[PDB]
Write an enzyme that holds these catalytic residues in place. Structure first.
Site, PDB file in Angstrom:
ATOM      1  N   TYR A   1      15.017  -9.860  20.479  1.00 18.23           N
ATOM      2  CA  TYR A   1      15.345  -8.847  19.485  1.00 18.23           C
ATOM      3  C   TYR A   1      16.684  -9.128  18.813  1.00 18.23           C
ATOM      4  CZ  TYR A   1      11.468  -5.763  20.773  1.00 18.23           C
ATOM      5  OH  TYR A   1      10.218  -5.217  20.969  1.00 18.23           O
TER       6      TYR A   1
ATOM      7  N   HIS B   1       5.774   3.722   8.318  1.00 15.81           N
ATOM      8  CA  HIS B   1       5.670   2.262   8.452  1.00 15.81           C
ATOM      9  C   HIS B   1       5.523   1.539   7.117  1.00 15.81           C
ATOM     10  CE1 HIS B   1       4.839   3.415  12.662  1.00 15.81           C
ATOM     11  NE2 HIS B   1       5.351   2.234  12.960  1.00 15.81           N
TER      12      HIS B   1
ATOM     13  N   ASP C   1      -6.795  13.555  -9.898  1.00  9.58           N
ATOM     14  CA  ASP C   1      -7.741  12.644  -9.256  1.00  9.58           C
ATOM     15  C   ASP C   1      -7.506  12.587  -7.750  1.00  9.58           C
ATOM     16  OD1 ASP C   1      -8.776   9.164  -9.788  1.00  9.58           O
ATOM     17  OD2 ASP C   1      -9.899  10.960  -9.214  1.00  9.58           O
TER      18      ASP C   1
ATOM     19  N   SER D   1     -13.585  13.039  -7.157  1.00 12.39           N
ATOM     20  CA  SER D   1     -13.058  11.845  -7.811  1.00 12.39           C
ATOM     21  C   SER D   1     -13.470  11.750  -9.289  1.00 12.39           C
ATOM     22  CB  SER D   1     -13.488  10.600  -7.036  1.00 12.39           C
ATOM     23  OG  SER D   1     -13.134   9.423  -7.733  1.00 12.39           O
TER      24      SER D   1
ATOM     25  N   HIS E   1     -12.013   7.066 -13.463  1.00 14.45           N
ATOM     26  CA  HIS E   1     -11.858   8.319 -14.201  1.00 14.45           C
ATOM     27  C   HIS E   1     -10.995   9.358 -13.474  1.00 14.45           C
ATOM     28  CE1 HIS E   1     -14.925   7.037 -17.099  1.00 14.45           C
ATOM     29  NE2 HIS E   1     -15.631   6.625 -16.062  1.00 14.45           N
TER      30      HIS E   1
ATOM     31  N   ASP F   1      -8.551   6.634  -8.217  1.00 11.23           N
ATOM     32  CA  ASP F   1      -9.703   5.957  -7.630  1.00 11.23           C
ATOM     33  C   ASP F   1     -10.893   6.017  -8.581  1.00 11.23           C
ATOM     34  OD1 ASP F   1     -10.788   8.617  -7.036  1.00 11.23           O
ATOM     35  OD2 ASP F   1     -12.007   7.617  -5.509  1.00 11.23           O
TER      36      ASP F   1
ATOM     37  N   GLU G   1     -16.190  10.870 -11.058  1.00 12.90           N
ATOM     38  CA  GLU G   1     -16.757   9.631 -11.586  1.00 12.90           C
ATOM     39  C   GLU G   1     -18.085   9.840 -12.302  1.00 12.90           C
ATOM     40  OE1 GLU G   1     -13.400   8.114 -10.988  1.00 12.90           O
ATOM     41  OE2 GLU G   1     -14.932   6.833 -11.891  1.00 12.90           O
TER      42      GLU G   1
ATOM     43  N   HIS H   1      16.218  -2.118  23.515  1.00 14.10           N
ATOM     44  CA  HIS H   1      15.465  -1.545  24.644  1.00 14.10           C
ATOM     45  C   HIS H   1      16.343  -1.364  25.891  1.00 14.10           C
ATOM     46  CE1 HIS H   1      11.297  -2.921  22.863  1.00 14.10           C
ATOM     47  NE2 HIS H   1      11.931  -2.054  22.094  1.00 14.10           N
TER      48      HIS H   1
END
Ligand SMILES: [Ca+2]
EC number: 4.2.2.21
Length: 991
Positions: free
Chosen positions: A448, A332, A148, A11, A40, A37, A13, A441
């Site tokens: 639904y 998702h 990164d 990372s 840097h 993250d 840092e 279903h």
């Protein structure tokens, strides 16, 4: 601080560069200009063909040889580019000297892009355990990249890595609807390109107004609302350095799956708990977009919200929410990205002014997978979940476009997609049915349907009264579905049997659907308003100008009242859902709803911690939904609550009375086509109803419980709906259970208020005649047992926690392990004492026969003869007019006079497949549990079944495509009915 500290995690840092990283014909440095993250990243400034070398044990591990663990070891990076190049980086992985695995990475982008690549599946060559070098080979040109969030190797859920413009090769095998953004973005239109006419340009203007009004209504921006916005926005720390945008990095929730095998205390929702997830971000952007539109032009707050929106736009686009970007893992993403589309649309004009609209348009099209709208539908219907989730994003993305021929092509494609999606779907598939059923279903699923209707209903209206309007067929189908729902719900609530996996008595229909469809106009397009829809709407919101909460609904309702529309009277007559195996009788304010199941349609949906005890919900149930005239019908008013409810004694059913621990559904994962679920369909095809003149009808079923539980338990049950009377007949009731009794339940009713308790103090009631506290009468000629359980004990449908309530029950006691049990009783809802005593002396019906062959019944006063024929009737049938039948079926005869007769026939067998029951047998011969999803016939067209009826005397009929006179003489008249869909076909007869 950087999230997750690991030996494999790079990372950057620290003030100094890691000693293990060296640069060839290139320069390296720690930069604070860009970061995914920490604060840097690694600035890698390269000359043509320069290398970046990371010399450390990559800690790759081979996949589990046993197959127990399916997780694959993956390499994960985020790359930043300030200057896009029509070229590609090469990632090389080496053991000591030689390269073993490699993968290309496109760098034709501006901002952050990710790559999650599995060593074994997605990479070129073959990975080896113990490789200790990472090479990043630059193309044959100079340039700069920032690196990164580099994880060398870690085990990861192998299903989820997604391909995009930078890594098109990733997860090539997958057909997961979440991950196919790239694959389906390549799709091309087939509707031909045309220029845009003046009328078409005005129509596109109209869809935008309609859509804006749909997702937004002008309001006020409170001081409290403004303070909340500023507090939430400041935490993102969005700032500018030398033209560059930076701030707190934002991930979508599933990005946490990278650290799954890395941290001992792993939480799938850790990124949401850190305030770093996308849902919150796009929710704030919508919030801000709404605030901007609710502010006066030229005010400091409008300028402030405009400023905040753009700053958030620049940063999220920089973070990687852009066309051709899937962040390495996108499964998702729908829920996190809900705010995206309305936030960007509400802010169209300002994005154009800033020269960022075309960009914005493309990202919306990308994440909504709008190109999925291009293909020509192969048949009728789409997944109910599509209407539920895919409509808003896709339409917004198209309305983002400039008024170009390409936008019209998209619109034509979108309308076509919705059009065929709304059309009557075959078998157990699609969304909507010919009889008004709504499927998810693989059965009729109101809970639904309600969500899917939101989409269908809104898109119908959006495109309505326009050259781009959906066909009459599509429009009428949805209208009929809503009209059916209004009929089987009472007043707004789903009946218990139709609750699916949530028998909580909470599920309701959405009044909005009706109001939206009212201002959509008639299906043919000739009417500005839909009269049936408008008056249906105003009944559902009737108070007893209506009162409503939602702003855009209140607008429609005001328009409807001003245009002179009034509320419906309570719908009357008979409904028969072949698709769903449901029959409903309606007189006055009450309803009587029957539900069974077949070899095509499952009895009840059972999930872990949802609907534990509903085994009997479709064992020929018959619920009476009622209320004192003037009050709105509620489960509470119909004498139903969850607490204390004996789950064995579902009103109307024939069932074995079990202890709750034995009645509980033993939920299993039966095959590869399902999850942790129980959905039991029978081996009998004969279950359903007929509807005569939409007014009366009958219902019949061969009940046969699945072998998983009490497989010996079978029964022949029938319902006969004549005017304000429902007569229930049963025969051939049998099982081999000698531990627990078999019962049909006439009624089970909750006693809640004071008046209900006082009514039962000593009410005997008779006699052959009963009457409950809800004003419904019961004619019971057979021996029946009455129970007054104050209180009665039960358990919650979901939690299983102990519940109690005051309950009153009347049951017909068949023995333990009955051989040929039977019952006969009639229900008259909303009656009086006088009618009941007169009914006891002279019953309005007479039973003609009641055995395994048929349940036949006539009513001289109503001039009706009801035929439920379970088998081909070898013998002259009673009644006087109907003599013989070709095959097991449903018939009803109404006599207008000695000269005029109304004949109606139905074939309950949906006929999705033709032969004997589709079964997989045990070693002992028991039926094996197989999920409905595993069956190959679930999308089949309902098969046509010829039904021939023989009638006494000479009769003249007007021939139809579905009814033909076959043979004729002085004594007889035989007709052939061509049956489909379990529908009711009727003809008028004249002597
Ligand atoms: Ca970093």
């Amino acid at each position: 601080a950087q999230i997750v500290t690991d030996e494999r995690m790079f990372s950057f840092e620290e003030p100094q560069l890691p000693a293990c990283i060296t640069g060839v014909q290139s320069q390296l440095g720690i930069s604070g200009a860009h970061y995914k993250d920490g604060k840097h990243s690694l600035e890698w400034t390269f000359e043509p063909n320069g290398r970046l070398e990371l010399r450390k044990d990559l800690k790759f591990e081979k996949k589990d040889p046993t197959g127990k663990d399916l997780y694959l070891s993956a390499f994960i990076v985020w790359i930043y580019n300030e200057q896009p190049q029509d070229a590609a980086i090469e990632f090389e992985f080496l053991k000591d000297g030689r390269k073993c695995a490699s993968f290309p990475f496109g760098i034709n982008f501006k901002g952050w892009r990710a790559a999650w690549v599995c060593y074994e599946r997605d990479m070129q060559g073959t990975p080896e355990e113990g490789m200790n070098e990472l090479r990043i080979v630059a193309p044959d040109a100079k340039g700069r990249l920032f690196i990164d969030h580099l994880i060398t190797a870690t085990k990861v859920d192998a299903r989820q890595q997604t391909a995009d413009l930078q890594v098109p090769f990733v997860n090539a095998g997958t057909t997961n609807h979440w991950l196919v953004l790239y694959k389906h973005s390549l799709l091309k239109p087939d509707i031909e390109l045309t220029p845009v006419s003046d009328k078409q340009r005005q129509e596109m203007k109209l869809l935008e107004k309609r859509f804006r009004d749909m997702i937004y209504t002008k309001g006020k921006v409170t001081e409290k609302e403004a303070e909340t916005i500023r507090k939430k926005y400041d935490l993102y720390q969005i700032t500018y350095k030398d033209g560059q945008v930076s701030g707190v990095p934002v991930f979508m929730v599933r990005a946490s799956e990278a650290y799954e095998r890395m941290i001992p205390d792993w939480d799938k929702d850790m990124l949401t708990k850190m305030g770093i997830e996308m849902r919150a971000y796009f929710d704030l952007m919508k919030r801000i977009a709404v605030a901007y539109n609710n502010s006066e032009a030229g005010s400091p707050i409008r300028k402030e919200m405009r400023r905040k929106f753009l700053a958030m736009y620049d940063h999220i686009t920089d973070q990687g929410v852009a066309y051709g970007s899937c962040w390495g893992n996108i499964h998702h993403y729908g829920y996190s990205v809900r705010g995206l589309y309305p936030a960007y649309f509400l802010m169209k004009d300002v994005l154009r002014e800033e020269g960022k609209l075309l960009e914005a348009e493309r990202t919306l099209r990308w994440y909504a997978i709008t190109n999925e709208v291009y293909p020509k539908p192969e048949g009728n219907g789409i997944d109910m979940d599509s209407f539920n989730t895919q409509t808003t994003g896709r339409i917004a993305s198209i309305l983002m476009m400039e008024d170009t021929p390409e936008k019209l092509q998209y619109l034509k494609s979108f309308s076509r997609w919705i059009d065929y999606g709304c059309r009557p779907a075959p078998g157990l598939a699609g969304s909507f049915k010919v009889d008004g059923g709504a499927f998810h279903h693989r059965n009729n699923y109101p809970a639904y349907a309600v969500g899917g209707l939101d989409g269908a209903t809104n898109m119908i209206y959006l495109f309505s009264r326009t050259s781009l309007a959906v066909s009459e067929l599509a429009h009428r189908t949805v209208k009929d579905v809503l009209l059916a729902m209004r009929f089987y719900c009472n007043k707004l609530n789903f009946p218990l049997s139709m609750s699916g996996r949530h028998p909580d008595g909470k599920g309701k229909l959405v009044p909005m659907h009706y109001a939206i469809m009212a201002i959509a106009g008639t299906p043919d397009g000739k009417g500005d308003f839909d009269k049936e829809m408008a008056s249906a709407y105003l009944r559902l919101v009737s108070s007893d100008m209506p009162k409503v909460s939602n702003a855009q609904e209140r607008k429609i309702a005001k328009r409807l009242v001003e245009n002179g529309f009034r509320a419906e009277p309570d719908p009357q007559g008979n409904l028969s859902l072949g698709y769903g195996c449901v029959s409903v009788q309606r007189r006055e304010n009450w309803s009587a709803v029957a539900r069974g199941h077949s070899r095509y349609l499952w009895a009840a949906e059972h999930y872990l911690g949802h609907n534990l005890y509903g085994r009997y919900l479709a064992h020929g149930s018959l619920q009476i939904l009622t209320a004192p005239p003037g009050q709105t019908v509620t489960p509470t008013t119909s004498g139903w609550q969850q607490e204390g409810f004996d789950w064995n004694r579902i009103p109307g059913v024939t069932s074995i009375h079990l202890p709750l621990d034995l009645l509980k559904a033993n939920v299993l994962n039966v095959d590869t086509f399902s999850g942790m679920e129980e959905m039991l369909y029978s081996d009998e095809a004969f279950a359903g109803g007929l509807s005569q003149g939409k007014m009366n009808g009958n219902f019949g079923m061969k009940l046969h419980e699945h072998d998983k539980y009490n497989g010996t338990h079978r029964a022949r049950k029938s319902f006969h709906f004549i005017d304000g009377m429902i007569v229930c007949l049963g025969s051939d009731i049998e099982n081999t259970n000698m531990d627990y009794p078999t019962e049909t339940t006439i009624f089970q009713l909750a006693v809640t208020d004071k008046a209900a308790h006082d009514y039962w103090k000593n009410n005997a009631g008779e006699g052959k005649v009963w009457m409950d506290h809800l004003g419904t009468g019961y004619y019971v000629p057979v021996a029946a047992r009455f129970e007054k359980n104050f209180p009665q004990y039960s358990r919650m449908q979901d939690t299983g926690k102990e519940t109690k309530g005051d309950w009153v029950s009347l049951i017909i006691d068949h023995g333990k392990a009955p051989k040929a049990g039977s019952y006969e009783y009639a229900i008259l809802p909303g009656t009086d004492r006088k009618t009941m005593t007169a009914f006891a002396k002279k019953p309005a019906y007479s039973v003609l026969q009641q055995d395994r062959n048929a349940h036949i019944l006539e009513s001289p006063s109503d001039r009706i003869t009801s035929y439920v024929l379970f088998e081909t009737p070898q013998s002259l049938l009673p009644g006087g007019l109907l003599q013989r039948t070709d095959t097991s079926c449903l018939v009803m005869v109404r006599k207008e006079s000695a000269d005029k007769v109304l004949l109606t026939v139905a074939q309950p067998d949906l006929a999705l497949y033709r032969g004997p029951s589709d079964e997989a047998f045990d070693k002992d011969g028991k039926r094996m549990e197989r999920s409905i999803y595993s069956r190959p016939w679930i999308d089949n067209e309902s098969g046509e079944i010829p039904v021939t009826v023989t009638l006494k005397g000479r009769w003249k009929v007007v021939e139809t495509p579905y009814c033909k006179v076959v043979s004729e003489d002085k004594k007889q008249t035989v007709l052939r009915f061509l049956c489909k869909d379990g529908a009711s076909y009727e003809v008028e007869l004249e002597k």
